[PDB]
Assembly symmetry: C3
Homo-oligomer: 327 residues x 3
């Protein structure tokens, strides 16, 4: 009687749970593939100015080739006319300060120093201190570097990411630009809803979507990641598989020591037969384009496994009801 | 009687379906791992010529280091003796054409322009038009660039990809060159059957296997991906795990706007104390080596799950036959 | 009687096997995700010396930007004052040796040669042999290169890897540096137990943990991979997810032909209006930072599938016991 009503209510509850959670919500009827094959072609385009200098893309984008990882230099500390010679050590180098020649040890190369110590105390670049003389690339950066801010109009720089994926097991291939001939990429601006196949992003848009302040991320540097997630359901048509662009800062923005991004490169010249160089310490924003994939397609093996599990679970509910009735 | 024959025929049909499709075909008795750890070492080697110039690998391969992504330059547009100064704007820049000084706005920096506008109309490099004067790197590329075709013998360039994978969960590690001392790599040519452990590919072979035409992909540029798939069955010996090299074009070859690959780099010089440069716009073929993995090894958990599913399915066939007989 | 004891012993054996192997050992109650999103920021810092030259990071680290793949140059073969002209071919080029002008074919460009053959026999750089004259970058490397060993103090170079992962499906994100303000990274040394969030590694430590000898890996070059495995169990707190750094050599160290790492880059100058260059062949150790992920979190679907399998298996044991008793 009523025992039958409760007995069948348990079965319906178990079947509901399976049909909803296991199948509709979690798609246990589906087999999944992750890690597609991606191709990223980037192209930064924009020009900026300094006190009397004009910087083009060749100057502030390293490396020049358009790939997943590139750095947009927003500030430089250039040390011009560096030659191999003898000069005072940087005041920031461990026990570089000296009062006499006895305080400097000859032939001492510090790995964090700027050269091999000559062994005699020399006046610093700006008085009145005295630092141990070193042989290396001179003058040192910490004594003869001039800072230039490039990124006054870095926010208006535009980056064009060209992505294309492929899912081998499911034979799915797609890109992030629509095959058109209407002059679209020459006048479009990215919008996650209106214009999703115009992957031309301003640097300022990327930074603000990452939650970052451009001045702080430009003076000290930073790393911002442009993440493309192709969470794809292959039972739906190919027009239902779209790229989702997320922006987030990838460097340890909270650790004071490791926050920032910078690197050194030099420009090499022969002046009167002697090799001179211009050491440039570049602070800038590195853009990493990370592509992530998660596909899904209906597979019969998972479906039958879960159906068998549902039947066994309904049987276990049967056993539980009978056991409660007996006791 | 005959009901028994049909009843057991249903069981045999269900068991066949499982034993064939679930186990033999799909290998549901197996656990899978994807995404191994890969190491790619590339080395392009070949020399080409121009009207009176000889180009070596250092000149047309960027970046010089041998990694997954590199570009082989097939054509350049070099603008020599570029200095920071004032010169006419490119005729391709928005509203650069002027008839008088009033048509040029002083201090206007266009992000797609080639400098900061001085504010006075100047004659173009070739008459009779007049363009707004700009301050930047001068002369501009669109007025003083000379094109040189490098890739006359690019098809005979040879790329040596050195790959090595590792599957952590299954403790499988392999490479794409056989440990030999017979002078093999100095005289071998790749063949997907005869010579699969001689990964020395001519650029023309890669292009033709990608279905591309070398002249069009060399003048305008392109991106070709060398895909290595280690679809591996670990129940078989290690000699049964082999690399499969596939070649396909990765750029949007159909979109007119985004088809092609190019980038700019410059050579910097000091001439009479003033920084001059040679801006080179390089059109070439980028080679991406993409390594994809899918391993499989027999695991007891999937086997028992599928066996339980088979037994439950045979029981469901039993129930269906009995239900048909009753009704 | 005793049949009951054996009958229930079989059930307990099957249940033990499941509860131990399927659940406790293999964690079949868990769903897994692999392939997180990684960000790698490297920074090599150290200075070395030669006979009379001091080398800084800008000189021996290529590329300058701090990413996953970079090369630390330990030895160079620099060919200075290379200009486009005519010079003897390298004695190592196929049939380059000549006895008279008839042995040289005019206009012959060998892809493995160093230029276009002029067609007349010229004396070699060192006597008494004679090689076919070529037009290219002259003098050739095999005749005018000078070797300098940089890596006397390469083992004391320190590399700072900055990693940060993210698991999308499980919403887990972590890095490899602890958020601190105690001046930790300026004085810490990595230890896999004591100091795991100080990812500052000496090059010598990386090499010795890889099992390599620094002198051989420095003269000839090599590739060493720094592997970070985030094998993560998400049922445990976030303090229980840690990076595991493994070091191994990635190049074919056993194949004599393919063992080693080297590349060429040049320094370009204008001398009296003619383009000269310094071709540098760099032998060094390439560091690849490979990040691998394997997360796990309790999921109800696998748990119920395995519980149903356990019940079915106990039933199959029931059937086997009854069948043995009947026969
Ligand atoms: C630095 O030099 C001073 C004076 O020569 C010496 O007392 C001190 O120990 C040195 N510090 C080192 C070597 O770390
Ligand atoms: C450049 O970007 C800034 C902020 O990102 C914006 O205020 C400014 O209007 C932009 N420039 C132009 C010409 O729109
Ligand atoms: C270009 O300049 C012309 C004349 O100064 C002006 O009419 C036009 O609006 C300008 N186009 C712009 C600013 O996009
Ligand atoms: C170079 O390649 C082209 C086509 O790829 C071929 O026709 C030619 O014979 C090759 N050169 C040599 C010397 O074999
Ligand atoms: C090299 O040159 C010699 C003499 O000209 C010739 O006999 C030989 O066949 C050549 N080898 C080649 C072209 O591989
Ligand atoms: C540099 O490293 C070597 C071995 O890696 C070691 O013997 C030497 O002591 C180190 N240098 C210093 C100053 O500790």
């Amino acid at each position: 009687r009523r025992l039958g009503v409760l007995y069948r209510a348990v079965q319906l509850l178990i079947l509901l749970y399976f049909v909803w959670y296991v199948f509709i919500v979690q798609k246990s009827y589906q087999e999944s593939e992750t890690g597609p094959e991606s191709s990223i072609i980037t192209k930064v385009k924009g020009i900026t100015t300094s006190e009397h200098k004009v910087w083009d893309v060749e100057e502030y984008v390293k490396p020049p080739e358009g790939g997943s990882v590139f750095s947009i230099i927003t500030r430089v500390e250039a040390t011009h006319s560096q030659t191999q010679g003898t000069c005072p050590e940087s005041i920031r180098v461990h026990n570089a300060t000296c009062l006499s020649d006895a305080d400097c040890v000859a032939g001492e190369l510090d790995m964090l120093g700027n050269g091999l110590r000559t062994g005699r105390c020399v006046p610093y670049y700006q008085g009145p201190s005295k630092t141990c003389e070193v042989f290396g690339w001179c003058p040192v950066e910490d004594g003869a570097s001039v800072s230039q801010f490039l990124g006054t109009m870095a926010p208006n720089f535009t980056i064009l990411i060209k992505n294309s994926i492929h899912y081998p097991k499911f034979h799915f291939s797609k890109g992030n630009i629509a095959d058109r001939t209407d002059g679209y990429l020459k006048r479009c601006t990215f919008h996650e809803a209106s214009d999703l196949y115009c992957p031309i992003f301003k640097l300022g848009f990327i930074v603000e979507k990452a939650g970052e302040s451009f001045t702080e991320l430009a003076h000290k540097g930073g790393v911002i990641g442009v993440i493309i997630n192709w969470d794809c359901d292959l039972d739906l048509p190919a027009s239902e598989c779209n790229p989702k662009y997320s922006f987030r800062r990838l460097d340890p923005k909270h650790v004071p020591a490791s926050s920032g991004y910078n690197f050194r490169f030099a420009k090499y010249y022969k002046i009167n037969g002697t090799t001179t160089r211009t050491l440039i310490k570049a602070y800038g924003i590195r853009i990493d384009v990370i592509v992530h994939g998660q596909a899904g397609k209906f597979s019969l093996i998972p479906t039958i496994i879960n159906l068998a599990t549902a039947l066994t679970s309904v049987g276990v509910g049967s056993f539980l009801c009978d056991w409660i009735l007996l006791t």
